[PDB]
Write a protein that binds this ligand. Structure first.
Ligand code: DGT
Ligand code: MG
Ligand code: MG
Ligand code: MG
Length: 539
DNA sequence: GACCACGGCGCC
DNA sequence: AAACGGCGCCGCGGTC
């Protein structure tokens, strides 16, 4: 390319190098652009950012987040990663995408700009004639990238002092548990080491090994194994409490307070747009799609996520979403009827499981019931079900029989999906998002059947993901209009922040947008709550 | 200090 | 653990 002075013309492809992967924490080390057989290298990149009307190129959203951080409204536009990810969602990194579609991801901004240009042309060519994938690019993924950049740049408020205090209390309880464990073992050891614990439980103590680990075949110390051993020895209950507390302390209570950004005073995640096989987003650096919610201590942690003063959180979560999606994709009349009658399948399973009235079903039970309902649907075995339910094998076996007897056209959808995946090599969502599953023809049964479970899950999980993305794209400009903010997506949930005076209106509008995003054979229902913290906002 | 493969486990 | 699926992060043990 011809070396041309900086500034590039309109529509040029950007390249940029960050000092580290996280755009909210990164120093912009270099910036360049490519168009019309020229390359333009920015003499000073922060200043040079001011010249661009959009970020067009590889990882466009990341540059846009750093721009937003610096007070500049630079929206992301075309990104070859999104084209590649729609072609094949195993296209997840610029290293891989470059190698596959015509270059090399280097560490030089000029080379990255030139690469972006050339990759876009090839990938755009691969998508010509792919009308449904192009519809996904233009109507969902490209506009969603802009939404995501705003969400990342906005961040979420965290009660840092509360978490610091919680740490000190949790440390004391951890000590009580670990001391009792060591007393019961007859000696101290590293309780965080599963290899050391294995020897203690199965060798030194008498306890029967329940199962084995996948890759190296050690005697497992998983929570499921330990639950089976609850009655066998008092040390087990202590280990399980220790595990809960140390998990929560090391993953959330301790790290999150140290991640507050000094310019915003907020916590800033990354919403990774080309990271999953099904078309879900992911969240990292810190992952805010797995904040605790289930146990009393987990709930305590979730309360640290709070609204700005003068604002409220609004949390919206699709009701029974993959079951509704399944009703649409399958066309089962009974399943469709269930949702037209306004019934809740999780609550029903929960009521049946724990033998209490529907009004007695608590959140723990509902989560237990979710495991059963999705478990059975996506191919859980009777043996595992026995344990989950804590009933005889023969009864757990019969539960699966009835499930599919009740909803007869699901199995037919499963089988059509699978043969189509064998013939075509891929499966697809309602909108035509594709996942290639080659091991559907594998001759090792365990490998083939694993592949099958991956393959027929994807149209359901992926259609839910497409719906939620679409709703995000539609909703974002309405929030801007009302002075509200989109903060988090958690797969079928959004967390917004709204001024107190407009919070009720924002909740109503966001609920309607999510519910009417793309009408199906059944209604989509959305549960909405408002509160000062994330826990209270889902109450 | 980094990176890893693994087991394990938090959420959806 | 087990014929549920999709993720990312932690600590260990190990390496470089
Ligand atoms: N395969 C599988 N999928 C799950 C599991 N938990 C959640 N999901 C998927 C299916 C859910 O429909 C979707 C959203 O999770 P939610 O916790 O919001 O559950 P759902 O929307 O079904 O119920 P809700 O009415 O919101 O309580 O993510 C699980 O244990 N296994
Ligand atoms: Mg839901
Ligand atoms: Mg949810
Ligand atoms: Mg792993």
């Amino acid at each position: 390319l011809e070396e041309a002075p900086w500034p590039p013309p309109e529509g040029a492809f950007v390249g940029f190098v960050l000092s580290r992967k996280e755009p909210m924490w990164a120093d912009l080390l270099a910036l360049a652009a490519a168009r019309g057989g020229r390359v333009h290298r920015a003499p000073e990149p922060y200043k040079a950012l001011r010249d661009l009307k959009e970020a067009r190129g590889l990882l466009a959203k990341d540059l846009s987040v750093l721009a937003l951080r610096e007070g500049l409204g630079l929206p992301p536009g075309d990104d070859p990663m999104l084209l590649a990810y729609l072609l094949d969602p195993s296209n997840t990194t610029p290293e891989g995408v470059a190698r596959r579609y015509g270059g090399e991801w280097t560490e030089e901004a000029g080379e990255r700009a030139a690469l972006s240009e050339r990759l876009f042309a090839n990938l755009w060519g691969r998508l010509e004639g792919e009308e449904r994938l192009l519809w996904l690019y233009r109507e969902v993924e490209r506009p969603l990238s802009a939404v995501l950049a705003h969400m990342e740049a906005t961040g979420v408020r965290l009660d840092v002092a509360y978490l610091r205090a919680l740490s000190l209390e949790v440390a004391e309880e951890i000590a009580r548990l670990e001391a009792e464990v060591f007393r019961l073992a007859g000696h101290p050891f590293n309780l965080n080491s599963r290899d050391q614990l294995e020897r203690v439980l199965f060798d030194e103590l008498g306890l029967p090994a329940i199962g084995k680990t996948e890759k190296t075949g050690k005697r497992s110390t998983s929570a499921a194994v330990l639950e089976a051993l609850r009655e066998a020895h008092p040390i087990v209950e202590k280990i399980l409490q220790y595990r809960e507390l140390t998990k929560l302390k090391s993953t959330y209570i301790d790290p999150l307070p140290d991640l507050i950004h000094p310019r915003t005073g907020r916590l800033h995640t990354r919403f990774n747009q080309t990271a999953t096989a099904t078309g879900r987003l992911s969240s990292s650096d810190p992952n805010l799609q797995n904040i605790p919610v289930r146990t009393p201590l987990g709930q305590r942690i979730r309360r640290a996520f709070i609204a700005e003063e003068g604002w409220l959180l609004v949390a919206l979560d699709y009701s029974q979403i993959e079951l509704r999606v399944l009703a649409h994709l399958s066309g089962d009349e009974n399943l469709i009827r269930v949702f037209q009658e306004g019934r809740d399948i999780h609550t029903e399973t929960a009521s049946w499981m724990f033998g209490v009235p529907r009004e007695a079903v608590d959140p723990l039970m509902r989560r237990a019931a979710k495991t059963i309902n999705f478990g059975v649907l996506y191919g859980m075995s009777a043996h595992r079900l026995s344990q989950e339910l804590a009933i005889p094998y023969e009864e757990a076996q019969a539960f699966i029989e009835r499930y599919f007897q009740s909803f007869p056209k699901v199995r037919a959808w499963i089988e059509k999906t699978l043969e189509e995946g064998r013939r075509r090599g891929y499966v697809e969502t309602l909108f035509g998002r594709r996942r290639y599953v080659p091991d559907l023809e594998a001759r090792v049964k365990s490998v083939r059947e694993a592949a099958e479970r991956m393959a027929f899950n994807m149209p359901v999980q992926g259609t839910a993901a497409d719906l939620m993305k679409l709703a995000m794209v539609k909703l974002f400009p309405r929030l801007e209009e009302m002075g509200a903010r989109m903060l988090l997506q958690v797969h079928d949930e959004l967390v917004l922040e709204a001024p107190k005076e407009r919070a009720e209106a924002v909740a109503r509008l966001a609920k309607e947008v999510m519910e009417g995003v793309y009408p199906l054979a059944v209604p989509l229902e959305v549960e909405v709550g408002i509160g000062e913290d994330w826990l209270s906002a889902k109450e």
